[PDB]
Design a protein around this ligand. Structure first.
Ligand code: NA
Ligand code: NA
Ligand code: NI
Ligand code: NI
Lengths: 170, 170
């Protein structure tokens, strides 16, 4: 349409993803790209008729959950200051009682440190945390091949994530 | 390649963009998508041989600049807490002495409030700030048409940005 050709949906939950894709279709969206650290969410996006997927190879999504938003924000603020100082690109959103943090562009050693800090910050502020992605480069190569076999036409990667993975593959 | 078909570059500066595209090409990248709030950076990406562009229609990029990183972070933290509470999706990175904040998925009235708060926070912490994007929907429709005339094959929009613009166009 006049506004563009492709809509990018960041999918943090399989049901919210399907709900978002349906709302955009009813608004007349023709092509929808789905981004997720969760391989099952990307597989569900293909099954629903999508074929452009945005993968997170070497990074991860940290999701803080709790009823006190100011406590989610205190945990997230610490993750942001540390991730930025290490040279990460970070994406944040609020989703019900969840604060989602997509982190790309840091090496595996730094990713492991950030994942540990996420567990500690969750304890400090009395909230829960889940990590999605951050698998080895070999498991990513496997999951990407599976998406292609399931009918993915275009797979996109953030350039910082891709450079970390090439440095790791070398 | 085995890792994907498209690399996404977030371009906050025209020279860094051209430097990043060249580094990725030398690493053997075939297709590079460029994302920017700056229409001139997207025009430069087309001229350099790219044809997939990611536009920011109704949102904006806030860039804090200063030598004290802890002062950039204090300003950015306030922008993050407010933007998230209003339901924005936010992307952050450090670029030399700059902290870049991409904000999408808030209506024009909230965008104006965030832009003002950015000016105030910059004064409070003794740093500078520049805003890119947040133009009316009509100026976006014009700039998108200009990218298509300059040879853009695929234009992508964040789904939250696109929904704000459709609600505004209604
Ligand atoms: Na702390
Ligand atoms: Na303040
Ligand atoms: Ni992304
Ligand atoms: Ni983006």
């Amino acid at each position: 349409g006049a506004m563009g050709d492709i809509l990018i949906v960041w999918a943090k939950d399989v049901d919210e993803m399907l709900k978002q894709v349906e709302i955009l279709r009813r608004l007349g969206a023709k092509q929808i790209a789905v981004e997720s650290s969760d391989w099952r969410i990307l597989q569900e996006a293909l099954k629903k008729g999508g074929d452009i997927l945005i993968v997170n190879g070497g990074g991860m999504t940290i999701t803080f959950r709790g009823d006190d938003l100011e406590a989610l924000l205190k945990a997230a603020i610490e993750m942001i200051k540390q991730a930025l100082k290490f040279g990460a690109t970070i994406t944040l959103s609020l989703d019900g009682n969840d604060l989602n943090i997509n982190i790309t562009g840091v090496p595996e050693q730094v990713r492991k440190e950030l994942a540990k800090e996420a567990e500690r910050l969750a304890k400090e502020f009395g909230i829960t945390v889940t990590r999605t992605g951050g698998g080895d480069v070999d498991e990513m190569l496997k999951q990407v091949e599976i998406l292609r076999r399931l009918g993915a036409k275009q797979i996109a990667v953030h350039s910082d994530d891709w450079r970390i993975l090439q440095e790791a593959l070398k």
